[PDB]
Homo-oligomer: A and B are copies of this chain.
Amino acid sequence: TGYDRQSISDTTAKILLEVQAVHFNAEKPFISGWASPVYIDCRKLISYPRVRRALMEMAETTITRDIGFEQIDAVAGGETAGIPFAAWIADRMMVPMQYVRKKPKGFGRNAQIEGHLEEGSRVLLVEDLTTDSRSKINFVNALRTAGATVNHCFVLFHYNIFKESVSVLKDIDVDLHALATWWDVLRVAKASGYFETKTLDEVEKFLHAPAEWSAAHGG
Protein backbone atom coordinates (compact mmCIF):
# COMPACT_ATOMS: atom_id res chain seq x y z
CA THR A 1 0.00 0.00 0.00
CA GLY A 2 2.50 2.76 -1.05
CA TYR A 3 5.53 3.32 -3.35
CA ASP A 4 7.82 5.96 -1.84
CA ARG A 5 8.89 6.44 1.78
CA GLN A 6 6.39 9.21 2.54
CA SER A 7 3.34 7.32 1.25
CA ILE A 8 4.42 4.20 3.14
CA SER A 9 4.78 6.20 6.36
CA ASP A 10 1.40 7.87 5.87
CA THR A 11 -0.28 4.52 5.24
CA THR A 12 1.38 3.02 8.32
CA ALA A 13 0.21 5.94 10.46
CA LYS A 14 -3.34 5.64 9.12
CA ILE A 15 -3.28 1.89 9.80
CA LEU A 16 -2.06 2.41 13.37
CA LEU A 17 -4.66 5.07 14.13
CA GLU A 18 -7.47 3.09 12.48
CA VAL A 19 -7.04 -0.14 14.46
CA GLN A 20 -6.48 1.99 17.58
CA ALA A 21 -2.96 0.64 18.05
CA VAL A 22 -1.95 4.23 18.90
CA HIS A 23 -3.55 5.93 21.90
CA PHE A 24 -3.31 9.56 23.03
CA ASN A 25 -4.08 10.69 26.58
CA ALA A 26 -2.79 14.02 27.90
CA GLU A 27 -5.01 14.25 31.00
CA LYS A 28 -4.03 10.80 32.34
CA PRO A 29 -0.53 9.84 31.15
CA PHE A 30 0.53 6.24 30.66
CA ILE A 31 2.98 5.21 33.38
CA SER A 32 8.18 1.39 35.48
CA GLY A 33 7.59 5.14 35.56
CA TRP A 34 8.06 7.12 32.33
CA ALA A 35 4.69 8.84 32.21
CA SER A 36 3.89 9.43 28.54
CA PRO A 37 0.74 10.65 26.76
CA VAL A 38 1.22 8.22 23.85
CA TYR A 39 0.71 4.45 23.93
CA ILE A 40 1.40 2.07 21.05
CA ASP A 41 0.64 -1.67 20.85
CA CYS A 42 1.96 -2.97 17.53
CA ARG A 43 0.99 -6.52 18.54
CA LYS A 44 -2.66 -5.71 17.81
CA LEU A 45 -1.79 -5.50 14.11
CA ILE A 46 -1.53 -9.31 13.94
CA SER A 47 -5.26 -9.65 14.71
CA TYR A 48 -6.36 -7.74 11.59
CA PRO A 49 -5.77 -9.67 8.35
CA ARG A 50 -5.92 -6.91 5.73
CA VAL A 51 -3.88 -4.58 7.95
CA ARG A 52 -1.12 -7.15 8.41
CA ARG A 53 -1.12 -8.00 4.70
CA ALA A 54 -0.69 -4.33 3.78
CA LEU A 55 1.99 -3.84 6.44
CA MET A 56 3.94 -6.86 5.20
CA GLU A 57 3.69 -5.69 1.58
CA MET A 58 5.07 -2.30 2.61
CA ALA A 59 7.74 -4.03 4.70
CA GLU A 60 8.91 -6.06 1.71
CA THR A 61 8.89 -2.92 -0.45
CA THR A 62 10.97 -1.03 2.12
CA ILE A 63 13.46 -3.90 2.49
CA THR A 64 13.88 -4.24 -1.28
CA ARG A 65 14.20 -0.49 -1.87
CA ASP A 66 16.50 0.42 1.04
CA ILE A 67 18.59 -2.74 1.52
CA GLY A 68 18.46 -4.65 -1.75
CA PHE A 69 16.78 -7.56 -3.46
CA GLU A 70 19.59 -10.11 -3.02
CA GLN A 71 21.28 -8.86 0.16
CA ILE A 72 19.32 -10.85 2.78
CA ASP A 73 19.51 -14.63 3.10
CA ALA A 74 17.54 -15.08 6.34
CA VAL A 75 15.08 -13.24 8.58
CA ALA A 76 15.44 -13.44 12.37
CA GLY A 77 12.70 -12.24 14.70
CA GLY A 78 12.74 -10.81 18.19
CA GLU A 79 11.87 -12.60 21.41
CA THR A 80 8.07 -12.81 21.17
CA ALA A 81 6.69 -9.67 19.47
CA GLY A 82 8.50 -9.66 16.13
CA ILE A 83 8.17 -13.40 15.42
CA PRO A 84 4.89 -13.17 13.41
CA PHE A 85 6.13 -10.24 11.33
CA ALA A 86 9.43 -12.04 10.76
CA ALA A 87 7.54 -15.15 9.64
CA TRP A 88 5.42 -13.18 7.18
CA ILE A 89 8.44 -11.29 5.82
CA ALA A 90 10.39 -14.53 5.42
CA ASP A 91 7.47 -16.11 3.57
CA ARG A 92 7.21 -13.11 1.24
CA MET A 93 10.98 -12.95 0.67
CA MET A 94 11.30 -16.76 0.28
CA VAL A 95 14.18 -16.87 2.75
CA PRO A 96 14.78 -19.08 5.80
CA MET A 97 13.37 -17.84 9.10
CA GLN A 98 14.94 -17.92 12.56
CA TYR A 99 14.13 -16.27 15.88
CA VAL A 100 16.38 -15.20 18.75
CA ARG A 101 15.56 -15.74 22.41
CA LYS A 102 16.09 -13.02 25.01
CA LYS A 103 18.07 -15.35 27.29
CA PRO A 104 20.26 -18.33 26.34
CA LYS A 105 18.87 -21.83 26.86
CA GLY A 106 21.81 -24.25 26.76
CA PHE A 107 25.50 -24.12 25.92
CA GLY A 108 27.10 -23.34 22.57
CA ARG A 109 27.19 -20.79 19.76
CA ASN A 110 23.56 -21.51 18.82
CA ALA A 111 21.94 -21.43 22.26
CA GLN A 112 19.98 -18.20 21.75
CA ILE A 113 18.97 -18.89 18.13
CA GLU A 114 16.11 -21.27 17.33
CA GLY A 115 16.17 -22.62 13.79
CA HIS A 116 18.87 -23.49 11.29
CA LEU A 117 21.36 -20.71 10.56
CA GLU A 118 24.13 -21.35 8.05
CA GLU A 119 27.63 -19.98 8.55
CA GLY A 120 28.12 -16.58 6.96
CA SER A 121 24.43 -16.03 6.25
CA ARG A 122 23.15 -12.47 5.92
CA VAL A 123 20.38 -12.05 8.51
CA LEU A 124 17.82 -9.26 8.84
CA LEU A 125 16.45 -8.56 12.32
CA VAL A 126 12.69 -7.90 12.39
CA GLU A 127 10.76 -6.80 15.48
CA ASP A 128 7.67 -4.73 16.20
CA LEU A 129 9.05 -1.41 17.46
CA THR A 130 12.04 0.41 18.92
CA THR A 131 12.35 3.02 21.64
CA ASP A 132 16.10 3.32 22.28
CA SER A 133 17.44 0.36 20.24
CA ARG A 134 19.13 -0.90 23.41
CA SER A 135 17.33 -4.26 23.33
CA LYS A 136 18.78 -4.69 19.82
CA ILE A 137 22.36 -5.25 21.03
CA ASN A 138 21.60 -8.63 22.61
CA PHE A 139 19.92 -10.08 19.52
CA VAL A 140 22.51 -8.74 17.07
CA ASN A 141 25.36 -10.08 19.20
CA ALA A 142 23.57 -13.43 19.56
CA LEU A 143 23.22 -13.70 15.79
CA ARG A 144 26.83 -12.64 15.21
CA THR A 145 28.10 -15.18 17.75
CA ALA A 146 26.52 -17.91 15.61
CA GLY A 147 28.29 -16.67 12.47
CA ALA A 148 25.53 -14.63 10.84
CA THR A 149 26.18 -11.25 9.20
CA VAL A 150 23.81 -8.68 10.72
CA ASN A 151 23.93 -5.26 9.06
CA HIS A 152 20.24 -4.31 8.71
CA CYS A 153 17.35 -4.13 11.17
CA PHE A 154 13.69 -3.69 10.25
CA VAL A 155 10.95 -2.55 12.64
CA LEU A 156 7.31 -1.62 12.04
CA PHE A 157 7.47 1.49 14.22
CA HIS A 158 10.32 3.75 15.33
CA TYR A 159 9.86 6.25 18.15
CA ASN A 160 12.47 8.66 16.72
CA ILE A 161 12.21 10.82 19.85
CA PHE A 162 15.49 9.68 21.47
CA LYS A 163 18.90 10.75 20.21
CA GLU A 164 20.59 7.33 20.40
CA SER A 165 17.80 5.47 18.57
CA VAL A 166 19.84 5.00 15.38
CA SER A 167 23.37 5.82 16.56
CA VAL A 168 23.45 2.82 18.91
CA LEU A 169 22.82 0.40 16.04
CA LYS A 170 25.18 2.31 13.74
CA ASP A 171 28.04 1.99 16.24
CA ILE A 172 27.76 -1.80 15.86
CA ASP A 173 27.38 -1.48 12.04
CA VAL A 174 23.63 -2.16 11.88
CA ASP A 175 21.22 0.02 9.91
CA LEU A 176 17.71 0.69 11.23
CA HIS A 177 14.79 0.59 8.78
CA ALA A 178 11.31 1.58 9.92
CA LEU A 179 7.93 1.83 8.25
CA ALA A 180 6.81 4.89 10.25
CA THR A 181 7.75 7.19 13.12
CA TRP A 182 5.92 9.13 15.84
CA TRP A 183 6.16 12.29 13.74
CA ASP A 184 4.28 10.63 10.87
CA VAL A 185 1.51 9.48 13.21
CA LEU A 186 1.33 12.96 14.72
CA ARG A 187 1.07 14.58 11.28
CA VAL A 188 -1.64 12.17 10.12
CA ALA A 189 -3.61 12.67 13.35
CA LYS A 190 -3.34 16.46 13.01
CA ALA A 191 -4.51 16.28 9.39
CA SER A 192 -7.45 13.97 10.17
CA GLY A 193 -9.04 16.35 12.67
CA TYR A 194 -10.50 13.64 14.91
CA PHE A 195 -8.36 14.72 17.89
CA GLU A 196 -8.68 17.79 20.10
CA THR A 197 -6.11 20.56 19.72
CA LYS A 198 -4.91 20.42 23.34
CA THR A 199 -4.17 16.69 23.17
CA LEU A 200 -2.14 17.09 19.98
CA ASP A 201 -0.24 20.06 21.42
CA GLU A 202 0.64 18.02 24.52
CA VAL A 203 1.73 15.09 22.34
CA GLU A 204 3.95 17.40 20.27
CA LYS A 205 5.47 18.85 23.45
CA PHE A 206 6.21 15.33 24.71
CA LEU A 207 7.70 14.24 21.38
CA HIS A 208 10.01 17.26 21.29
CA ALA A 209 11.32 16.73 24.86
CA PRO A 210 10.40 13.25 26.12
CA ALA A 211 12.47 13.17 29.31
CA GLU A 212 11.47 16.68 30.43
CA TRP A 213 7.77 15.97 29.85
CA SER A 214 7.98 12.62 31.64
CA ALA A 215 9.79 14.04 34.67
CA ALA A 216 7.36 16.98 34.97
CA HIS A 217 4.17 14.88 34.73
CA GLY A 218 4.76 12.05 37.21
CA GLY A 219 8.08 10.45 36.32
Q: Please report A residues at the B interface, Cβ cutoff 8 Å.
A: 1-3, 7, 11, 14-15, 18-19, 43-44, 46-54, 61, 64-65, 68-71, 74, 79-81, 83-84, 86-88, 90-91, 93-99, 101, 114-117
Contact A65 B18 (CB under 8 A): no
- Nearest CB of chain B from residue A113's CB, rounded to whole Å: 10
When distances are taken between beta carbons in the complex, the residues of chain B under 8 Å from A71 are 18
A7 to chain B, nearest CB (A): 7
CA A52 to CA B87, docked complex, whole Å:
11
Q: Would you call A46 and B94 a contact (CB within 8 A)?
A: no
A68: which B residues are within 8 A, CB to CB?
14, 18
Q: Within the complex, what minimum Cβ distance (angstroms) separates A170 from chain B?
A: 18
How many copies make up the complex?
6
Which residues on the B side are within 8 Å of A61 (C-beta)?
1
A-B contact sample (6 more), CB < 8 A, given A18-B70, A48-B96, A80-B80: A1-B3, A18-B69, A46-B115, A49-B96, A84-B99, A87-B88
Q: Is there contact, CB below 8 Å, between A50 and B79?
A: no
Q: A1-B65, A3-B2, A3-B3 are in contact. Are A80 and B114 (CB under 8 A)?
A: yes
A59 CB → nearest B CB, Å: 13
* Contact indicator B84/A97 (Cβ below 8 Å): yes
Distance A84 CA – B3 CA, assembled complex (angstroms): 27
Name the contact of A84 in the complex, choosing from B47, B65, B87 (C-beta under 8 A). Answer: B87
With both beta carbons as reference points, the residue of chain B lying nearest to A61 in the complex is identified as B1
| Complex contact A50–B65 (CB within 8 A) | no
Which residues of chain B are near A79, meaning CB under 8 Å? 80
| Contact across chains for A46 and B84 when beta carbons are under 8 A apart | no
Query: Cβ of A50: which chain B residues have Cβ within 8 Å of it?
Result: 64, 69-70, 93-94
Contact A44 B115 (CB under 8 A): yes
Q: Specify the chain B residue showing the minimal Cβ separation from A20.
A: B116
Q: Which of A1, A53, A95, A114 is most buried by chain B, counting CB atoms within 10 A of its CB? A: A114
In whole angstroms, what is the CA distance A50 to B86 when docked?
17
| Nearest B residue (CB) for A55 | B69
Chain B residue at smallest Cβ distance from A11: B65
Measured in the bound complex, the distance between the Cα atoms of B91 and A171 in whole Å is 37
